Design a protein around this motif. Structure first.
Motif, PDB file in Angstrom:
ATOM      1  N   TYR A  87     -15.991  -8.851  -9.737  1.00 17.16           N
ATOM      2  CA  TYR A  87     -14.619  -8.724  -9.264  1.00 17.16           C
ATOM      3  C   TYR A  87     -14.093  -7.318  -9.518  1.00 17.16           C
ATOM      4  N   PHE A  88     -14.060  -6.905 -10.785  1.00 16.84           N
ATOM      5  CA  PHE A  88     -13.490  -5.609 -11.132  1.00 16.84           C
ATOM      6  C   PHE A  88     -14.326  -4.441 -10.617  1.00 16.84           C
ATOM      7  N   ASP A  89     -15.625  -4.651 -10.368  1.00 16.25           N
ATOM      8  CA  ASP A  89     -16.465  -3.583  -9.835  1.00 16.25           C
ATOM      9  C   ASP A  89     -16.226  -3.357  -8.351  1.00 16.25           C
ATOM     10  N   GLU A  90     -15.822  -4.397  -7.630  1.00 20.76           N
ATOM     11  CA  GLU A  90     -15.741  -4.347  -6.183  1.00 20.76           C
ATOM     12  C   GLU A  90     -14.314  -4.381  -5.662  1.00 20.76           C
ATOM     13  N   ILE A  91     -13.314  -4.481  -6.527  1.00 19.33           N
ATOM     14  CA  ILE A  91     -11.913  -4.617  -6.042  1.00 19.33           C
ATOM     15  C   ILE A  91     -11.414  -3.290  -5.437  1.00 19.33           C
ATOM     16  N   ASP A  92     -11.712  -2.148  -6.072  1.00 20.32           N
ATOM     17  CA  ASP A  92     -11.231  -0.882  -5.517  1.00 20.32           C
ATOM     18  C   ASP A  92     -11.781  -0.629  -4.121  1.00 20.32           C
ATOM     19  N   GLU A  93     -13.054  -0.950  -3.906  1.00 15.25           N
ATOM     20  CA  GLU A  93     -13.652  -0.789  -2.589  1.00 15.25           C
ATOM     21  C   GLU A  93     -12.956  -1.666  -1.555  1.00 15.25           C
ATOM     22  N   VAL A  94     -12.647  -2.917  -1.913  1.00 14.74           N
ATOM     23  CA  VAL A  94     -11.933  -3.800  -0.993  1.00 14.74           C
ATOM     24  C   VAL A  94     -10.565  -3.226  -0.658  1.00 14.74           C
ATOM     25  N   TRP A  95      -9.871  -2.687  -1.660  1.00 14.57           N
ATOM     26  CA  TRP A  95      -8.541  -2.143  -1.421  1.00 14.57           C
ATOM     27  C   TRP A  95      -8.598  -0.900  -0.545  1.00 14.57           C
ATOM     28  N   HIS A  96      -9.604  -0.050  -0.756  1.00 14.42           N
ATOM     29  CA  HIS A  96      -9.740   1.150   0.060  1.00 14.42           C
ATOM     30  C   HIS A  96     -10.127   0.804   1.492  1.00 14.42           C
ATOM     31  N   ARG A  97     -11.046  -0.150   1.665  1.00 20.10           N
ATOM     32  CA  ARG A  97     -11.617  -0.433   2.981  1.00 20.10           C
ATOM     33  C   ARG A  97     -10.630  -1.170   3.879  1.00 20.10           C
ATOM     34  N   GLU A 115      -7.669   0.824 -17.685  1.00 21.35           N
ATOM     35  CA  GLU A 115      -7.753   2.139 -18.248  1.00 21.35           C
ATOM     36  C   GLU A 115      -8.041   3.229 -17.200  1.00 21.35           C
ATOM     37  N   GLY A 116      -8.452   2.838 -16.013  1.00 20.30           N
ATOM     38  CA  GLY A 116      -8.884   3.713 -14.945  1.00 20.30           C
ATOM     39  C   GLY A 116      -7.731   4.090 -14.049  1.00 20.30           C
ATOM     40  N   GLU A 117      -8.056   4.861 -13.020  1.00 17.76           N
ATOM     41  CA  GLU A 117      -7.116   5.241 -11.977  1.00 17.76           C
ATOM     42  C   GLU A 117      -7.442   4.423 -10.734  1.00 17.76           C
ATOM     43  N   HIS A 118      -6.453   3.633 -10.380  1.00 14.22           N
ATOM     44  CA  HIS A 118      -6.475   2.674  -9.332  1.00 14.22           C
ATOM     45  C   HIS A 118      -5.132   2.638  -8.620  1.00 14.22           C
ATOM     46  N   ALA A 119      -5.086   2.142  -7.407  1.00 11.14           N
ATOM     47  CA  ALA A 119      -3.831   2.104  -6.704  1.00 11.14           C
ATOM     48  C   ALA A 119      -2.816   1.207  -7.374  1.00 11.14           C
ATOM     49  N   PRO A 120      -1.570   1.612  -7.359  1.00 11.17           N
ATOM     50  CA  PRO A 120      -0.542   0.882  -8.085  1.00 11.17           C
ATOM     51  C   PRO A 120      -0.376  -0.526  -7.679  1.00 11.17           C
ATOM     52  N   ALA A 121      -0.345  -0.806  -6.407  1.00 18.55           N
ATOM     53  CA  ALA A 121      -0.172  -2.175  -5.980  1.00 18.55           C
ATOM     54  C   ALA A 121      -1.328  -3.032  -6.458  1.00 18.55           C
ATOM     55  N   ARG A 151      -3.155  -2.401  -9.266  1.00 19.36           N
ATOM     56  CA  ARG A 151      -2.955  -2.589 -10.698  1.00 19.36           C
ATOM     57  C   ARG A 151      -1.968  -3.715 -10.970  1.00 19.36           C
ATOM     58  N   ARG A 152      -0.927  -3.813 -10.141  1.00 19.98           N
ATOM     59  CA  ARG A 152       0.042  -4.889 -10.273  1.00 19.98           C
ATOM     60  C   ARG A 152      -0.641  -6.249 -10.180  1.00 19.98           C
ATOM     61  N   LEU A 153      -1.498  -6.444  -9.180  1.00 18.46           N
ATOM     62  CA  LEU A 153      -2.129  -7.747  -8.990  1.00 18.46           C
ATOM     63  C   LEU A 153      -3.111  -8.055 -10.111  1.00 18.46           C
ATOM     64  N   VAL A 154      -3.825  -7.041 -10.599  1.00 16.48           N
ATOM     65  CA  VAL A 154      -4.709  -7.251 -11.738  1.00 16.48           C
ATOM     66  C   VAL A 154      -3.896  -7.567 -12.984  1.00 16.48           C
ATOM     67  N   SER A 155      -2.748  -6.906 -13.146  1.00 15.53           N
ATOM     68  CA  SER A 155      -1.873  -7.202 -14.275  1.00 15.53           C
ATOM     69  C   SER A 155      -1.426  -8.657 -14.246  1.00 15.53           C
ATOM     70  N   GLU A 156      -0.968  -9.128 -13.084  1.00 16.00           N
ATOM     71  CA  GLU A 156      -0.519 -10.514 -12.964  1.00 16.00           C
ATOM     72  C   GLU A 156      -1.639 -11.486 -13.315  1.00 16.00           C
ATOM     73  N   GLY A 157      -2.835 -11.265 -12.766  1.00 17.12           N
ATOM     74  CA  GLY A 157      -3.959 -12.117 -13.111  1.00 17.12           C
ATOM     75  C   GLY A 157      -4.306 -12.049 -14.585  1.00 17.12           C
ATOM     76  N   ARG A 158      -4.255 -10.850 -15.163  1.00 16.57           N
ATOM     77  CA  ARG A 158      -4.515 -10.716 -16.591  1.00 16.57           C
ATOM     78  C   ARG A 158      -3.531 -11.544 -17.405  1.00 16.57           C
TER      79      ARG A 158
END
Ligand SMILES: [Zn+2]
Length: 850
Positions: A778-788, A820-826, A828-835
């Protein structure tokens, strides 16, 4: 598309005042195949400028602007771009602009949507314009505070029906088309303009005159769905609303007629276009459904009707008041349901479904005030807004609130208004100070806890009573003013049920408020400090009242106090104050007259059973979860079997079993019901119940992909395709989860709802071990999904695949490491909510094994 800012809108509104649009749409080519991309759009706009010689612009999203002519001068549109619109230089005091353009259909329910139907070849259109997609169909100053009248004329394929905001006249053209000339509308905002066009099936009715004129009524749906549409029941509920709102609001229905159209591929749920309301097709029921779905449909019907006054007759000046628009319509729909329909227990529904969504959302790290600033159009909760609005009604007083509403409607009719305009009318009507009120309720986050502090004499009468209020959390920790009612419940002398023996209403302010009215009053068996569910809060009980709830919740006679007790127990479980295994015991009961099995409100049964499954999967200590599910599945089989044949309760019990972790005995019983060898008498095993039971058998290894294929051939429909996709995802093998993951994460050709359906079967409470390796993926592939993918398509993938299944600190550590990384804000929000959900489950699991 343009990103109209508030300041831009204000500048344009200061300058311009629009009188009328005359729109001519050439849809004669609209019945062809997928290649048809555009339709002809001619707009004539008469508007005034306050500064002659000034410049301004008008919006339009088209492929080609053929002609633009302002006051007879030809404008240069060679450099036209969708994002820039058409410049209007050298404006006069009174202007007339004529534009000929080619606008394109959409597949996204943005603007004018186009869809083609397989069963019969039919081509169906409909508009969706909120927020600013009117510009995709006609040339307009696309902002809510430049109201105008519209006269719409459409040339269409001769077999199409056409529906718009106003009534119309049809003329045969002799060229395989018909021309639909709609009356000039009353003044309205561009986003409320409607067009629905296609071979829709039609039903007609009339609401008789009541100072309110007769209202012609219509209902429209796709030809293929017409056999399933219960038009008579929809017209009854529609008529019940029109008899209610005129009296409640003191203003008759402002438009001429009222059509309601069920439209395909609707993203928005329902849309209050003036005189032509559009609805998602899930409200047309192909299978047997419980009374709760009928209630929820009625609520949405009345939600959109209320907007005819609040929203359409008087409209927000700007979109920062969108929250208030929706919040009011939610409150008014439930008011109308209780006052005018068969759904007299609809405040029970609001307390159990809307409020519980409000709390959950308010306690997320993403929480924000109800009234956020909206600087642009892409800057554009409602549950909390609705909840807080209900408390505003209580604080002002219902009678004063309605009196203020008539003042507001009369004063701002055919015009625009803000939140402050409403608050002023309600101040004038009530004598309250609402400036202070908004700062405490609309610009803050978080909840107060309310609980009684009491002392009783030998005879059981109160010697002292106060309401204790905790600081608003998460947030600034303020104490709010609440208008609430305290209810005392005790045994009914004729029935033994718990019934209300006292209510007092009062303003609660600060950390503590004394209630002198309660001194000398017998305390009964149950005290509710939020009786009648007037305020937004976390209610808690004194020791004796909590013991009574645990012992006899099913004994409470009225559904609303009983639902408030179910809500308290649930929110205590979510907050680690009641043990998950104690919530389960309370729900499951020990007899036919205890727990959720004795609950008459079918919406409560379904919601509480869902929360119980959350408590088992997420909040129960992992050592106890196998025994919890053994208890749940056994109790549900016994309840489904004892239930009255063909009843809603019977169906709800079977549907809950279909979502459960099941042992062999339940699987054998379910197989018997699906294939008929040993049916449950009265149970209608229709097409959507078949999918539910099949998916449950698939999830437990008792049915393979062969049976999924077999069920899909007996249900070859778009819905069937989605339910078959969920079943294939549910197959409990590493091979099936790997395929579903790849298709959901990486296949962009697949349609949206099919990607949604794939994800919906990825998780199952009995398959936790199969999914362990996908916490890291999940965390390895989420940035790619968001970019694509675009944010609209990426969001459901990110939310739906978050590993809320893995409740473990290792999951928090992986989420922490990702953060801890640099990711798009929106994102990060969704990962925060799930966390946050996982953190909360860990605290509950800690409390459960204690
Ligand atoms: Zn609404």
């Amino acid at each position: 598309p343009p990103n109209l800012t508030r300041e831009q809108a204000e500048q344009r509104a200061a300058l311009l005042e629009v009188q009328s649009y005359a729109i001519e749409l050439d849809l004669s080519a609209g019945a062809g195949g997928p290649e048809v991309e555009t339709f002809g759009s001619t707009t004539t706009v008469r508007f005034r400028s306050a500064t002659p010689g000034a410049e301004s612009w008008i919006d339009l999203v088209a492929a080609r602007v053929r002609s633009a002519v302002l006051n007879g001068v030809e404008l240069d549109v060679s450099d036209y771009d969708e994002s820039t619109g058409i410049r209007l230089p050298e404006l006069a005091a009174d202007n007339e602009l004529v534009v000929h353009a080619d606008c394109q259909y959409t597949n996204t329910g943005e603007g004018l949507h186009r869809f083609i139907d397989p069963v019969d070849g039919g081509v169906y259109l409909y508009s969706q314009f909120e927020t600013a997609d009117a510009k995709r169909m006609f040339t307009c100053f696309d902002q809510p505070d430049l109201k105008a009248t519209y006269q719409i004329t459409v040339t269409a394929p001769q077999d199409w029906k056409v529906i718009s905001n106003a009534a119309g006249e049809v003329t045969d053209t002799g060229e395989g088309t018909r021309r639909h000339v709609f009356d000039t509308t009353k003044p309205m905002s561009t986003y409320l303009v409607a067009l629905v066009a296609g071979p829709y099936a039609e039903w007609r009715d009339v609401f008789p005159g009541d100072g309110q004129d007769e209202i012609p009524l219509g209902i429209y749906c796709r030809a293929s769905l017409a056999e399933h549409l219960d038009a008579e029941r929809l017209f009854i509920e529609t008529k019940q609303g029109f008899g209610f709102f005129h009296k409640a609001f003191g203003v008759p229905y402002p438009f001429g007629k009222y059509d309601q159209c069920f439209v395909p591929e609707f993203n928005a749920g329902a849309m209050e276009n003036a005189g032509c309301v559009t609805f998602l097709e899930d409200y047309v029921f192909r299978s047997r459904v419980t009374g709760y779905l009928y209630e929820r449909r009625s609520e949405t019907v009345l939600h959109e009707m209320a907007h005819m006054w609040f929203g359409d007759l008087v409209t927000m000046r700007w979109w920062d008041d969108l929250w208030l628009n929706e919040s009011f319509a939610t409150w008014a729909s439930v008011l109308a349901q209780v006052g005018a329909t068969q759904y007299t227990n609809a405040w029970t529904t609001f307390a159990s479904v809307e409020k519980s969504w409000a709390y959950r959302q308010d306690q997320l790290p993403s929480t924000h005030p109800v009234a956020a600033d909206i600087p642009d159009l892409q800057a554009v909760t409602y549950a909390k807004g609705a909840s807080v609005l209900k408390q505003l009604v209580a604080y002002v007083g219902l009678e004063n609130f309605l009196a203020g509403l008539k003042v507001y409607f009369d004063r701002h009719a055919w015009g625009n208004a803000t939140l402050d305009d409403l608050l002023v009318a309600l101040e004038e009507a009530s004598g309250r100070d609402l400036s202070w009120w908004s700062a405490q309720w609309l610009q803050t986050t978080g909840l107060n806890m309310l609980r009684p502090k009491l002392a009783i004499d030998d005879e059981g009468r109160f010697t002292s009573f106060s309401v204790l209020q905790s600081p608003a959390r998460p947030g600034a920790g303020e104490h709010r003013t609440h208008r609430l009612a305290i209810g005392i419940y005790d045994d009914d002398p004729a029935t033994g049920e718990l019934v209300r023996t006292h209510r007092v209403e009062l303003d609660v302010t600060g950390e503590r408020t004394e209630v002198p009215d309660l001194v000398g009053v017998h305390r009964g068996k149950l005290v509710l400090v939020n009786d009648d569910d007037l305020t937004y809060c976390t209610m808690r009980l004194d020791p004796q009242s909590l013991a009574t709830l645990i012992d006899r919740i099913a004994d409470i006679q009225e559904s609303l106090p009983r639902a408030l007790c179910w809500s308290t127990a649930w929110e205590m479980t979510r907050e680690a104050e009641l043990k998950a295994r104690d919530f389960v015991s309370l729900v499951l009961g020990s007899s036919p007259t205890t727990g959720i099995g004795a609950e008459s409100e079918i919406g409560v049964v379904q919601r509480v059973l869902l929360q119980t499954q959350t408590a088992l999967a997420s909040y129960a200590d992992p050592a106890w979860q196998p025994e919890g599910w053994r208890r749940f599945a056994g109790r549900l089989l016994e309840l489904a079997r004892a239930a009255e044949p063909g009843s809603d309760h019977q169906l709800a019990f079977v549907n809950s079993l279909a979502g459960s972790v099941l042992g062999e005995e339940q699987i054998s019983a379910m197989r018997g019901w699906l294939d008929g060898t040993a049916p449950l008498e009265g149970l209608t095993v229709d097409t959507d119940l078949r999918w539910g039971l099949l998916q449950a058998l698939v999830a437990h290894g008792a049915a393979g992909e062969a049976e999924i294929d077999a069920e899909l051939e007996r249900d070859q429909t778009a819905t069937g395709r989605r339910r078959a996709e969920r079943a294939r995802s549910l197959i409990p093998t590493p091979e099936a989860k790997e395929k579903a993951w790849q298709r959901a994460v990486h296949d962009d050709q697949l349609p949206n709802a099919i990607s949604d359906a794939i994800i919906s079967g990825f998780q199952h409470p009995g398959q936790r071990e199969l999914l362990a390796s996908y916490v890291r993926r999940y965390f390895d592939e989420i940035d790619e999904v968001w970019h694509r993918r675009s944010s609209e398509r990426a969001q459901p993938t990110v939310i739906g695949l978050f590993p809320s299944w893995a409740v473990d600190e290792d999951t928090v550590a992986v989420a922490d490491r990702w953060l801890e990384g640099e990711h798009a804000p929106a994102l990060r929000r969704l990962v925060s909510e799930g966390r946050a959900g996982i953190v909360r489950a860990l605290a509950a699991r800690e409390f459960d094994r204690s």
